[PDB]
């Protein structure tokens, strides 16, 4: 049974049973609380096929996260179209006093990403191989604000798995993109630690669909998934920071047409 | 609808069939899988498991002890350092002695969850976290052991517990009851009806010496879940006492000893 069927099943469930609800913008959503799906990474890559997912943006934004940048210019000029302490800065300089987008951060804060990599290497049985990220807007809001998302990695025999917990997920636009991003991150980490990719498990608290996305998703629901493509890494790479876009090749990606979602 | 306990029994079976033999922090083996989730309705029933007798008195008593923020082993019987309770009520405050005065120190995560449900029922950040105390001196900014996310839908309150690892034999049935209980308490305080308790795990493991007891537990048919009654209108989370709670129609199979 095709992994994408979980995603399509979840969309349908929210359309049928979702509760109408308002969020921080004046846009309506349908909402359900608590979801989980498991995508195999073993000889395949969960880049969704019921619509064309913008792979180049996934790869480029992730590399941008990884180099710890807080500058929109470094991502725009790659063709994906000062951001403050965004996810990337938190991954590489967790808990450091944020200055400018070109200040010197070398070895300040906790490098959560290198720490995940080091722990996989020093204790593959460790149940604490965890990275967290905060929505930057929460940071001045209150003392000790809760994280927006966390990733827990797990080594089982020679396979590396990842579970992403997000306190809320945009099922229409954000989720397919994130399935791809964190599956890619798992491939990168597995590669660097000499492990094979296992599963990506995606878990949500608030799983919502925007009202203006209902019609496109209803049509997406009538399309049959095609076998997932493969991700090939073209070069032995030894450090997370050494990966570049050209090291990656998606092979056999055969998707249905792009669906625009506002 | 199918019985909620069948999720737990299915998960036990799955770990026995497909789980990987591993080793945890101690010299005891486990069978283990990564990533699990179950959803237990709290609507006119309470998910206290029936395929074995769960020690309800200990669930209730330990939870009240967590809630009053105590770090004293004696107060529960019948100094642990900054255990789960202290973190719930005094998050981030420098822990010292157990008889020390912790008033207005740290963040009261529990009261904050209660206040947020009251000030913004749509908020997606109604979250509290707890750390294994042993991790605290191990490294800088260690990750949490567990998190609870609460969610108001119309007038129902739901809770999702994420634990980075769970003992499926001993710890899970007990935690299902504790966090379902906590949701009932918070729902009561905030004028809401309990909704769902969602239990999500990273490492879900069974200790090797529990395999035989669980295999036997797997042969037992769940009986309908009991109800939980709260016996008086209670105003604040700190005012609940053991005698305010009454489990009704608990009809379980016999105690299974595990350890
Ligand atoms: Cl996309
Ligand atoms: Cl028990
Ligand atoms: Cl546990």
Author numbering:
A (entry chain A): 27 to 107, 130 to 310
B (entry chain B): 26 to 103, 130 to 310
From the paper:
Human thymidylate synthase (hTS) is an obligate, stable homodimer with two active sites, each including residues from both monomers. As a dimeric enzyme, it provides the sole de novo pathway to deoxythymidylate (dTMP) synthesis in human cells by catalyzing the reductive methylation of deoxyuridylate (dUMP) to dTMP using methylenetetrahydrofolate (mTHF) as the one-carbon methyl donor. By interacting with its own and other mRNAs, this protein regulates its own levels and those of other proteins involved in apoptotic processes, including bcl2, c-myc, and p53. Its inhibition is usually achieved with compounds that bind at the protein active-site, competing either with the dUMP substrate, such as 5-fluorodeoxyurdine 5’-monophosphate (FdUMP), or with the folate cofactor, such as raltitrexed (RTX) and pemetrexed (PMX) (Carreras and Santi, 1995; Jennings and Willis, 2015). Here we report the discovery of molecules that bind at the hTS monomer/monomer interface and, despite their small size, markedly shift the monomer-dimer equilibrium of the enzyme towards the inactive monomeric form.
We selected the ‘Y202 pocket’, which accommodates the side chain of F59’ from the other monomer, as the most promising region to target. We therefore made the Y202C mutant and screened for compounds able to form a covalent disulfide bond with C202 from a library of organic disulfides. We made mutants with single point mutations at C195S and Y202C to test their functional and structural properties as well as the double mutant, hTS C195S-Y202C. Panel (c) reports the omit map (contoured at 3.0 σ) showing the S,S(2-hydroxyethyl)cysteine (CME) chemical modification occurring at the mutated residue C202 in the single hTS Y202C mutant. (d-e) H-bond interactions (represented as dashed lines) involving the CME202 residue in hTS Y202C subunits A and B. (f–g) two views of the surface of the hTS Y202C dimer. The two symmetry-related subunits are shown in violet (subunit A) and orange (subunit B), while the CME and S-methyl-thio-cysteine (SCH) residues are represented as spheres. Only SCH43, appears fully solvent accessible, with CME202, partially visible in its pocket, just below SCH43. Panel (g) shows that SCH180 is partially solvent accessible, while SCH195, CME199, and C210 are buried to different extents below the hTS surface. Four molecules, A5, A10, A20, and TPC also bound peptide (D186-R215) DLPLMALPPSHALCQFCVVNSELSCQLYQR (sequence C), containing the engineered Y202C together with the native C199 and C210. In agreement with the described computational and crystallographic data (see above), Y202C is the most exposed of these three cysteines and is thus easily available for disulfide-bond formation with the RS fragments, being therefore suitable for tethering experiments.
